[PDB]
């Protein structure tokens, strides 16, 4: 039977908005019929409701703004798999390959990335509680930047899912992922790499969407998270078929970020450089700045993967994973920085291009 889920990080919860996920083979007409049913049954009980979005492509279901009072009712609807309360996520060669970036707005005319980044018209961000585009612009530059990029031949498409403070929603991220899959079906191109340099609490729906996208043949790279914690407790970091990237520094140390730092554990696939990373600064068209985080590390791995996929376009996801591991530097990271029980579980791998 159908279950209800909400973010375990209580300050990250977004009460009043729910993702109703329907069973796997449900098609659009049914999803719409189920949404209209909910509204009608709700209205019968005096409750106002608004359908914000109907999903199809990866997940069948819909986004509804309504009172949580209606959850028991909604969970008895036909075709419902589960319902998840929305919650927040936060900012943390290559020529045949398209790299999608879901992040903040970007400065596309920055000389480092000018002409290699295409701003899609997709935008889904929550209202706030040069600066708006610092995070995305730096990460675009890490992937494909002319002077400081990993994969200079890669072309990028950017979607905006984080606001000016680097905050987005799970629901907004889902709609962004759906938009990527939709665009692909409409106009197929080569291998896709989807970069998700963000993280929220463990999300069943976000992990499921990522898993479906991966099963459909798309490569997903994510930030492990900057909480000095087990990456399995965060999403999309914990989605298994995603490539989850932790951050190391020039001394082969896991990265310290204030009192926190890189996440670790069995959900991390490998590490990459993620401290003191020079890259495009959106302050001016030729400006550069150094930044740190698992976002930057993920961006390195998206660039390596783009180069690898351009060289070997037939690689399956599992084969791409084997290459990333095979080509990594091994056992260079200081394991003593990790909690004692996590040292064996945390792969001692720093990503590298093949020579």
């Amino acid at each position: 039977t159908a279950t209800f889920h909400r973010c375990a990080k209580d300050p990250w919860r977004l009460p009043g908005t729910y993702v109703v996920v329907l069973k796997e083979e449900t098609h659009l007409s049914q999803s719409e019929r189920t949404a209209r049913r909910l509204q009608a049954q709700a209205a019968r009980r005096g409750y106002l409701t608004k359908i914000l979005h109907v999903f199809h492509g990866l997940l069948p279901g819909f986004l509804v703004k309504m009172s949580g009072d209606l959850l028991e009712l909604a969970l008895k609807l036909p075709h419902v798999d589960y319902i998840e309360e929305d919650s927040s996520v936060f900012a943390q060669g290559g020529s045949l390959v398209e790299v999608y970036l879901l992040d903040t707005s970007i400065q596309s005319d920055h000389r480092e990335i000018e002409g290699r980044v295409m701003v899609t018209d997709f935008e889904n961000v929550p209202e706030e509680d040069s600066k708006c585009d610092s995070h995305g612009t730096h990460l675009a530059g890490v992937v494909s930047g002319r002077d400081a990029g990993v994969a200079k031949g890669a072309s990028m498409r950017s979607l905006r899912v984080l606001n000016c403070q680097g905050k987005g929603t799970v629901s907004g991220t889902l709609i962004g992922l759906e938009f990527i899959r939709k665009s692909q079906l409409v106009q197929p191109v080569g291998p896709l790499v989807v970069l998700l340099p963000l993280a929220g609490g463990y999300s069943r729906v976000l992990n499921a969407a990522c898993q479906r996208l991966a099963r459909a043949g798309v490569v997903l790279v994510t930030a492990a998270g900057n909480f000095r914690d087990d990456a399995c407790l965060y999403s999309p970091a914990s989605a298994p078929e995603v490539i989850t990237v932790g951050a190391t520094n020039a001394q082969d140390q896991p990265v310290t970020l204030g009192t926190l730092g890189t996440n670790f554990g069995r959900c991390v696939d490998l590490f990459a450089p993620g401290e003191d990373i020079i890259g495009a600064s959106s302050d001016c068209s030729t400006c550069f700045v150094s930044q740190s985080g698992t976002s930057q590390a993920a961006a390195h791995v998206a660039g390596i993967a783009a180069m690898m996929l351009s060289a070997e376009p037939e690689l399956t996801l599992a084969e791409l994973r084997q290459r990333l591991i095979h080509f990594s530097a091994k056992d260079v990271i200081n394991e003593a920085w990790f909690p004692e029980d996590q040292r064996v579980l945390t792969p001692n791998l720093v990503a590298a291009l093949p020579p």
Binding site: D147, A148, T286, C287, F288
Partner: peptide
């Protein structure tokens, strides 16, 4: 520290 050109970053590092 924001550098206004790539070369300014190169001289710095």
């Amino acid at each position: 520290t924001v550098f206004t050109s790539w070369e300014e970053y190169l001289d710095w590092v």
